[PDB]
Amino acid sequence: NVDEVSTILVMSRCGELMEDSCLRKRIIEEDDQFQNVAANFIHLIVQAFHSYTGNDIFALNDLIDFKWPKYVSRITKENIFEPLALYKSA
Amino acid sequence: NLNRHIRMNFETFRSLPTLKNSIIPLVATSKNFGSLCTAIKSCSFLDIYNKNQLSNNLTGRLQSLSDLELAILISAARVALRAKDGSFNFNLAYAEYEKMIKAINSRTIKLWLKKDVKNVWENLVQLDFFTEKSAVGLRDNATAAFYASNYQFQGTMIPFDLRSYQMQIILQELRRIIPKSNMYYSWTQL
Amino acid sequence: SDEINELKEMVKDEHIYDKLVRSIAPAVFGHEAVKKGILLQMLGGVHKSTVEGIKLRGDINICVVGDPSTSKSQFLKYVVGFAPRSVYTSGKSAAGLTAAVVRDEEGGDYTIEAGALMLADNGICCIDEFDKMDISDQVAIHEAMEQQTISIAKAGIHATLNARTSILAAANPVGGRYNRKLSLRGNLNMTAPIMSRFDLFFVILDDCNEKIDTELASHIVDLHMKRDEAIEPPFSAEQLRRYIKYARTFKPILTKEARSYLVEKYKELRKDDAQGFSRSSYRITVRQLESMIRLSEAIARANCVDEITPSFIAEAYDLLRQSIIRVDVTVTYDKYVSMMNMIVRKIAEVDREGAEELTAVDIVDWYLLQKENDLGSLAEYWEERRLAFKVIKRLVKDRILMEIH
């Protein structure tokens, strides 16, 4: 359902999103803090594509990788602690 | 509780190997002697096995759908019901779905573009809901399976928006497996 | 002196448009969309005159289309037995509606006899069974639906008689039940120019629902037992007649800000008919643009406002869209739309102003200052707070709102 799909993607994609090369290069140009950031992007993707994908795991995993580099570059020194301004910028 | 499950299987299945498929996991799942006498008296594990066997059919697959997957199947059912032979395609299903969103908001549901329903349309076909018109499907023996693979059907050359499909469930059966709390219940009467 | 004091408190009420709808036809339960057009039809628009001598039609004609045995005779009998100068007629002659030239047996000359469209001037003419009319009898009706005049040329009498009435038809679909697979033209036994004269087409569908039939059967039993005791309208019959005649003297003027909203709303409605996806039952012509002006003037007249506010255009646009039904190829529904329209503009205003965020505690606190006339006291006040949590919960599951943390 909608409660088990998001929980599976969190415990399966958090170990590869916070240690990516794009996120590590953005904090030096502009571990508990990076966990909530990657978990917020996964929850925002499922809630915004629950009707386009349905309940498939492959349909939601491709949309995360397609929007991960575009979501990291839109994070500055102020969007790290304020999740409200980060959703409006992207 | 043991005599109730036997009498229920006697008038529905009446088969010994069929009823034995639930007694085997009931005993193996018991940790000690106290858990074996409890599950054999209340038969709590037998009700869970019956729900799992009817969870991937036409009824259990409807509860695992979102709001858009239910609106497409409902709008496509009204087209085949009002027709003579029940033939419909992606163009006929999109016309009924577009007229339903503008009618509800007039009395905010995000109206998806035509480029986004293609992914939802292909997901319902794999879930056994939209069958091709005049399609054999799975052959009986291996002789007819080889001759059907070498012949190119007419449904593969035509685009996806002009493929004649058929509904696996009529609108009369969708009104019974949908509660009154859903907002798509008013568009299932016609 | 007391009649002026009773009229002053009604205008000051912020919910006068919701009280006048329930007061009209209390015997018929439900159908709030059809009852909204009755209030706007009794007031009408502003009959403006051009600089060349042409008179613009300010009346609004509404046609009752739906399945039989749906309280159709109750709505027509309520307008006749309330509005002054109203003649009740049916479709099953050509001379009884407009006029007739019958020679007097005493004088000997040819005289003009008034009909149904002449004795009920400046009122509402209730006509029943419009689909069962003849071809010759329907030609004289369409003639009086343009310039509100009747041209008579017989027995050497060439005179023009005015007919500024409001036709309230109530036809029946061909086949008994309303077919959703067909259009409005193919389902009714009327012509094309006559069907285009009506500004609204309230389609009453006879749906077999368990919740609708339960509340409808309870109102009939309570009406047959208590008779006049069960009817408790917010306004009496004497108070409603004084507000209708007083609101007809007001002439609202379209402002500059409301002119851009009417043109923008007309372009969005015309785009739905030219896309080819939603097959509408009637093509949008030029009369649909003039119908929105007459409907917006009747809404501002009921509020005693001489300026057409842009908010009245959105109310008339929703009623016109509900009448155009496309061809099919716990919580009150009236409260869910009001709580949803106020929660969208409030969140969207944060992005324009530039604030911080909006938590779940501030959501319920936003309606605590705007709904000061809820009359919740203490027992009913806590029930509205629990309902606000259930309303914001449905938006979370749906694709409308979301929660960050």
Tab-separated table of C-alpha atoms in Angstrom, chain A residues 2 5-6 9 39-55 59-60 63-64 67 71 87 90, chain B residues 66-68 110-112 115-116 119-120, chain C residues 395-403:
chain	number	residue	atom	x	y	z
A	2	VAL	CA	1.043	3.662	0.324
A	5	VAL	CA	6.032	1.286	-0.406
A	6	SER	CA	7.591	4.443	1.046
A	9	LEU	CA	12.316	2.691	-0.509
A	39	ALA	CA	14.591	10.642	3.601
A	40	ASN	CA	12.640	13.822	2.824
A	41	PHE	CA	13.345	13.543	-0.911
A	42	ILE	CA	12.126	9.932	-1.013
A	43	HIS	CA	8.889	10.791	0.801
A	44	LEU	CA	8.314	13.800	-1.468
A	45	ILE	CA	8.814	11.711	-4.619
A	46	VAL	CA	6.333	8.986	-3.642
A	47	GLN	CA	3.637	11.460	-2.574
A	48	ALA	CA	4.034	13.366	-5.866
A	49	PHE	CA	4.081	10.292	-8.150
A	50	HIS	CA	1.715	7.931	-6.325
A	51	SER	CA	-0.874	8.305	-9.104
A	52	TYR	CA	1.551	8.224	-12.049
A	53	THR	CA	3.405	5.084	-10.907
A	54	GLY	CA	0.867	3.368	-8.625
A	55	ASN	CA	2.560	0.831	-6.328
A	59	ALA	CA	8.581	2.840	-11.617
A	60	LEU	CA	9.433	4.830	-8.475
A	63	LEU	CA	12.126	8.717	-10.962
A	64	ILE	CA	14.400	9.098	-7.921
A	67	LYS	CA	15.633	13.859	-10.067
A	71	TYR	CA	17.569	18.236	-6.253
A	87	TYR	CA	10.351	22.481	-1.665
A	90	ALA	CA	12.456	22.919	-6.726
B	66	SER	CA	-4.317	4.658	-6.279
B	67	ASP	CA	-6.836	7.387	-7.120
B	68	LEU	CA	-5.798	7.601	-10.783
B	110	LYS	CA	-4.897	17.596	-10.477
B	111	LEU	CA	-5.814	16.796	-14.088
B	112	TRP	CA	-3.020	14.710	-15.600
B	115	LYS	CA	1.448	11.959	-21.749
B	116	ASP	CA	1.121	10.679	-18.159
B	119	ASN	CA	2.211	4.728	-17.938
B	120	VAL	CA	-1.005	4.091	-15.996
C	395	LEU	CA	-6.348	16.199	1.986
C	396	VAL	CA	-3.206	14.419	3.209
C	397	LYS	CA	-4.232	11.092	1.663
C	398	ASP	CA	-5.381	12.830	-1.530
C	399	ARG	CA	-3.163	14.776	-3.933
C	400	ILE	CA	-4.086	18.279	-2.741
C	401	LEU	CA	-2.035	19.125	0.356
C	402	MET	CA	0.988	17.549	2.022
C	403	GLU	CA	2.909	17.516	5.300
